[PDB]
Amino acid sequence: CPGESLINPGFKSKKPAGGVDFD
Amino acid sequence: CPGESLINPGFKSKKPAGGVDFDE
Amino acid sequence: SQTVASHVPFADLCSTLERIQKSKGRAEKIRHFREFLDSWRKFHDALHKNHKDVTDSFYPAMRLILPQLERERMAYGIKETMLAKLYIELLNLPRDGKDALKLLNYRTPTGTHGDAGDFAMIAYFVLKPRCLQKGSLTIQQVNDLLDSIASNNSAKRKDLIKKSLLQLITQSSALEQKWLIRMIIKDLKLGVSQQTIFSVFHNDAAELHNVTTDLEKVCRQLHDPSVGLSDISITLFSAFKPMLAAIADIEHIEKDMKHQSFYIETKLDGERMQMHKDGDVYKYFSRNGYNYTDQFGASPTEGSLTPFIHNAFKADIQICILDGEMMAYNPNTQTFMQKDLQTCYCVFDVLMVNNKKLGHETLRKRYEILSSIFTPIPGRIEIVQKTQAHTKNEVIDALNEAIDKREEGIMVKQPLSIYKPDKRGEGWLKIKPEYVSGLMDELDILIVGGYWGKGSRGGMMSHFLCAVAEKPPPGEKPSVFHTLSRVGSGCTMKELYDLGLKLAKYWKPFHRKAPPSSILCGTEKPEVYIEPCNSVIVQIKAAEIVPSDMYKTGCTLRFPRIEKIRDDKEWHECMTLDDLEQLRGKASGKLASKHLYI
Amino acid sequence: QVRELATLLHMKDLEIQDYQESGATLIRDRLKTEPFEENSFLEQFMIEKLPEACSIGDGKPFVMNLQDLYMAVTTQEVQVG
Amino acid sequence: FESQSEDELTPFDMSIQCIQSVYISKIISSDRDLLAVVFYGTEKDKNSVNF
Amino acid sequence: SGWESYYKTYSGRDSLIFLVDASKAM
Amino acid sequence: ANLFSDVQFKMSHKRIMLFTNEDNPHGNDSAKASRARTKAGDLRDTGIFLD
Numbered sequence: 087c088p089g090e091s092l093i094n095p096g097f098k099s100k101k102p103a104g105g106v107d108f109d
Numbered sequence: 110c111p112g113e114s115l116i117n118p119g120f121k122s123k124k125p126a127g128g129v130d131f132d133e
Numbered sequence: 134s135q136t137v138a139s140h141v142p143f144a145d146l147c148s149t150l151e152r153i154q155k156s157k158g159r160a161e162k163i164r165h166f167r168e169f170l171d172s173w174r175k176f177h178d179a180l181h182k183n184h185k186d187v188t189d190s191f192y193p194a195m196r197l198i199l200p201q202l203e204r205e206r207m208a209y210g211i212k213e214t215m216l217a218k219l220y221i222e223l224l225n226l227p228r229d230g231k232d233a234l235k236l237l238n239y240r241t242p243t244g245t246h247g248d249a250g251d252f253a254m255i256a257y258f259v260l261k262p263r264c265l266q267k268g269s270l271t272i273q274q275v276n277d278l279l280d281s282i283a284s285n286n287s288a289k290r291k292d293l294i295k296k297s298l299l300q301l302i303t304q305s306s307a308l309e310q311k312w313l314i315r316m317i318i319k320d321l322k323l324g325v326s327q328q329t330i331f332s333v334f335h336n337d338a339a340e341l342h343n344v345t346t347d348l349e350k351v352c353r354q355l356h357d358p359s360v361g362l363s364d365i366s367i368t369l370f371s372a373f374k375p376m377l378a379a380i381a382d383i384e385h386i387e388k389d390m391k392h393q394s395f396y397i398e399t400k401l402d403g404e405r406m407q408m409h410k411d412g413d414v415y416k417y418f419s420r421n422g423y424n425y426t427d428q429f430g431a432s433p434t435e436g437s438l439t440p441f442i443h444n445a446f447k448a449d450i451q452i453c454i455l456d457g458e459m460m461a462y463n464p465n466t467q468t469f470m471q472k473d474l475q476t477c478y479c480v481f482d483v484l485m486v487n488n489k490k491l492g493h494e495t496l497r498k499r500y501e502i503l504s505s506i507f508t509p510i511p512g513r514i515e516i517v518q519k520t521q522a523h524t525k526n527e528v529i530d531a532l533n534e535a536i537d538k539r540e541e542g543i544m545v546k547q548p549l550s551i552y553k554p555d556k557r558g559e560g561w562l563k564i565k566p567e568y569v570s571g572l573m574d575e576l577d578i579l580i581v582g583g584y585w586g587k588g589s590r591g592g593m594m595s596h597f598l599c600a601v602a603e604k605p606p607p608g609e610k611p612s613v614f615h616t617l618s619r620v621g622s623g624c625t626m627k628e629l630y631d632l633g634l635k636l637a638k639y640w641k642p643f644h645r646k647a648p649p650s651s652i653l654c655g656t657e658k659p660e661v662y663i664e665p666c667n668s669v670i671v672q673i674k675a676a677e678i679v680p681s682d683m684y685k686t687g688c689t690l691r692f693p694r695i696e697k698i699r700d701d702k703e704w705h706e707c708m709t710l711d712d713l714e715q716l717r718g719k720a721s722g723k724l725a726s727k728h729l730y731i
Numbered sequence: 732q733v734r735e736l737a738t739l740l741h742m743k744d745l746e747i748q749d750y751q752e753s754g755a756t757l758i759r760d761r762l763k764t765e766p767f768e769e770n771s772f773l774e775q776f777m778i779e780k781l782p783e784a785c786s787i788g789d790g791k792p793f794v795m796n797l798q799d800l801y802m803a804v805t806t807q808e809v810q811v812g
Numbered sequence: 813f814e815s816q817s818e819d820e821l822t823p824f825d826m827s828i829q830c831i832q833s834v835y836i837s838k839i840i841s842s843d844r845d846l847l848a849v850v851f852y853g854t855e856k857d858k859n860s861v862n863f
Numbered sequence: 864s865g866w867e868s869y870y871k872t873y874s875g876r877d878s879l880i881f882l883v884d885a886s887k888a889m
Numbered sequence: 890a891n892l893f894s895d896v897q898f899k900m901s902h903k904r905i906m907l908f909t910n911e912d913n914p915h916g917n918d919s920a921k922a923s924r925a926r927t928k929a930g931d932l933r934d935t936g937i938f939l940d
């Protein structure tokens with residue numbers, strides 16, 4: 087239930103692409 | 110109604126017959 | 134073109150109906166109806182001042198007050214079950230929710246929610262929180278919506294009728310919708326007799342309605358209270374109430390006939406109809422005035438009877454009215470079949486020929502005219518055979534012959550009797566084996582199921598499903614049953630309540646998926662089933678046995694009626710299946726196979 | 732305590748209102764209770780029953796009905812300091 | 813149609829933007845879904861029930 | 864003036880039933 | 890609900906979104922609030938998810 091996409095039910099809300107984040 | 114007989118509803122409860130009761 | 138109905142909100146009529154219903158004495162109901170009618174008449178008088186040929190009348194509200202008498206509108210096609218389904222679909226209520234089950238299973242009192250037999254009350258309770266408090270639909274709009282619904286049902290348009298019902302629901306209050314439901318079911322339960330309503334409307338409203346069989350004509354012609362109709366009699370192309378017959382006394386016939394010769398004729402099992410012929414135009418009307426011309430045809434070019442019976446009429450008969458019975462004549466056996474085969478019309482009365490009225494004429498003249506109006510042809514049109522008799526012995530012999538011929542009784546008529554529409558016994562009597570005591574063979578059988586009642590008998594068992602027992606092996610009791618028929622009448626209210634209490638604790642719900650082993654059903658499944666070891670033996674005075682595909686035994690009883698819930702006999706003394714077969718084969722159907730000796 | 736009882740009574744009044752809105756009627760009618768109002772109840776009490784309640788008299792009511800609370804308050808005070 | 817602060821989109825504008833974003837997301841991701849827009853509280857009415 | 868103006872809005876016999884308890888205390 | 894019924898396909902999710910900035914739409918009249926609550930409950934049983 088938590089994290090489910092509000093636009094497409096049944097699919098988890100994909101995290102936005104972060105590219106490369108150097109530590 | 111006050112005084113109504115418990116035996117015959119709708120009729121006043123007749124008081125007992127006393128007779129002659131000489132006063133003081 | 135202005136109509137009073139358009140200016141009358143439906144709320145006023147609903148409030149008047151509710152006030153009439155809640156009243157216990159007929160005086161208050163009459164007062165309320167008179168006040169409403171006076172208000173309507175005052176509005177009518179105030180509205181039309183300089184307009185001629187005013188076609189407005191009380192019909193828009195008169196039809197709603199008595200939906201059962203509506204004839205202009207076609208059959209609605211929606212009843213308690215269909216109406217409940219439509220309400221569930223439109224309101225978007227859950228299919229398996231409490232409200233949906235209560236609406237569908239309105240007869241079941243397990244919900245113990247107010248009334249348990251009145252569908253209208255349950256619908257009102259369900260709709261109280263879903264509808265507004267004040268409506269906005271007038272009588273004219275409601276009538277238009279009802280006519281649209283009727284046409285939609287006749288026009289095979291489910292979407293349009295659904296839309297009309299949705300509009301009615303969305304534009305009415307709880308009380309208004311309850312009254313609409315009651316009108317649709319055609320059962321208002323006002324408590325005031327139809328004759329009283331007609332008398333209040335007009336002095337001779339009932340007679341005119343019987344003569345014409347149309348509310349619109351009665352409402353229009355009998356509008357003013359003071360201005361009545363000088364004469365009222367059967368008219369062409371106007372259905373009139375048929376003349377019925379009352380129960381016949383078996384040892385007072387002479388006293389009933391005033392000591393004169395009387396006609397006796399075998400009673401026919403068919404459909405009562407009245408035919409009006411006007412030149413090349415035919416109009417067929419049923420017992421209740423419903424138009425059957427479509428089935429029988431309006432012109433010789435179409436129909437099932439007129440195209441073939443037109444040739445039987447004489448050249449000098451341009452205007453005619455006939456009253457008779459329709460039966461199914463089989464030419465292979467050349468005989469009539471009780472309710473290849475072709476429609477056959479047996480005529481027995483003529484209330485009008487040419488330009489004269491036979492209503493007030495004596496029966497002898499009517500019979501002579503009927504014999505001298507057309508030439509009968511067997512199989513299509515014929516004349517009932519009447520036999521003269523003046524002693525009880527002849528009546529007994531005729532009844533014996535009818536029983537021996539597997540007929541359905543005889544009818545006795547007085548020569549001087551006149552035709553009076555809607556009269557239950559004025560010279561016409563019917564003698565059947567049912568009325569005579571002891572002629573019929575009583576059928577004692579067990580009770581295996583029951584159904585919940587409707588209306589007054591809401592929270593109790595109103596009708597029951599009975600079964601006969603099989604033949605068990607010697608020294609063993611019967612544990613297998615086959616359903617025979619259903620019995621709903623014949624038991625008094627006190628006796629019905631006593632029977633229900635006697636088996637109230639032993640009642641068990643019936644599940645279709647898991648039918649009981651002891652009781653095996655066919656197509657009809659009782660709502661509640663009771664095991665056979667604890668049950669009463671009900672006695673039924675069945676009229677005849679007919680082939681039924683809805684029961685395991687394959688046969689059912691015509692006109693079943695309970696006579697007594699016998700207590701002396703136990704549950705194991707019911708009839709056997711072999712006994713049922715023997716009884717069926719004793720006389721090939723009809724149970725009446727015993728003569729009358731006195 | 733009076734405040735707690737008043738709020739509990741208000742909650743029960745809300746429950747009664749919800750029950751009435753549900754579309755139900757009481758089996759009887761004597762059990763019907765008019766809505767509770769703190770201001771009206773307090774005014775009626777002060778006007779009617781205050782003279783009797785305020786009558787301490789010889790102190791018997793104080794030792795008859797106000798001792799458990801007195802003991803609890805004294806215990807709380809001594810525990811605090 | 814009233815904004816507490818200045819230069820801030822009104823609630824109606826925000827709702828319209830969100831509806832448009834959802835429409836675009838549905839078109840790109842799954843165009844077979846069904847979307848509807850209904851306004852209440854207005855003066856004009858357009859319903860199958862004529863509410 | 865519209866529809867609002869034209870439309871507005873001993874005998875017998877007494878019977879007694881004696882109910883007597885059958886409890887032990889009686 | 891009528892709009893949902895009008896659909897003829899098979900719906901795996903029936904959802905409603907309410908864009909409003911009023912927390913007390915029906916305060917003057919209590920009957921309207923009761924009717925709204927009943928309708929919302931009926932929609933919930935029918936299988937409609939409201940946000």
Ligand SMILES: *OP(=O)(O)OC[C@H]1O[C@@H](n2cnc3c(N)ncnc32)[C@H](O)[C@@H]1O
Nearest residue numbers: 377378398399400401402405481517544
């Ligand atoms: O049982 P019931 O009162 O319905 O029976 C009377 C009806 O049956 C019609 N009927 C049947 N047979 C005849 C004959 N031979 N003559 C006249 N009428 C007959 C009655 O008309 C009535 O509808």
